[PDB]
């Protein structure tokens, strides 16, 4: 009967020489990806897509960082047409808007590959 354990925390070497002023975690947010509009939102992009109407053209990735998200979540081209339930057209427009309002906020990117709809959730890094 009965039972005694330990209830003792980890060791403490105490070896710090910096006051710092920030936090830290395992996985952090990222959004350092370069993209470009299909063609400045033109009729040519419409036919290239399939049969849009509410979107009309969009943005396509052409430079992934460490090919992390492109590893599978998205293709090399990654043609995103929707972002955070919002319509886009130019990488500079969506990038500026995102970095403008809602800092460090999480958004959902919706792209299409060979007529195959594919959406993924990604969190933008603040500061």
Domain ranges of the chain: 29-127
Strands 106-113 and 86-87: unpaired
Rounded CA-CA distance 73/25 in Å is: 23
Regarding the domain delimited by 29-127, which CATH topology (the fold level of the hierarchy) does it fall under? Pdz3 Domain (2.30.42)
DSSP letter at 51 equals S
Hey, how many other C-beta atoms are within 10 angstroms of the C-beta on 113? 13
What is the enclosing helix (H) or strand (E) of 94?
A: helix 91-100
CA angle 16/19/20 to nearest 5° reads 110
Q: Which method resolved this structure?
A: NMR
Contact predicate 79/48, CB 8 Å = no
- From the number of C-beta atoms within 10 Å of its C-beta (0-12, 13-18, 19+), residue 114 rates as exposed
DSSP E strands in 1-127: the ranges are: 34-37, 59-63, 79-83, 86-87, 106-113, 116-123
């Amino acid at each position: 009967m009965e039972g005694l354990g330990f209830a003792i925390p980890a060791n403490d070497a105490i070896n710090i020489i910096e006051q710092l002023e920030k936090n830290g975690k395992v996985t952090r947010p990222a959004l350092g990806i370069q993209m470009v509009n299909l063609s400045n939102v033109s009729t040519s992009d419409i036919r290239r897509l399939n049969i849009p109407s509410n979107v009309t053209s969009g943005v396509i990735v052409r430079s992934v960082q460490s090919n992390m998200p492109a590893n599978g979540h998205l293709e090399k081209y990654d043609v995103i047409t929707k972002v955070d339930d919002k319509e886009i057209a130019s990488s500079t427009d969506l990038q500026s808007a995102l970095y403008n309002h809602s800092i460090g906020d999480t958004i959902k990117i919706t792209y299409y590959r060979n007529g195959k709809e594919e959406t993924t959730s990604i969190k933008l890094n603040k500061l």
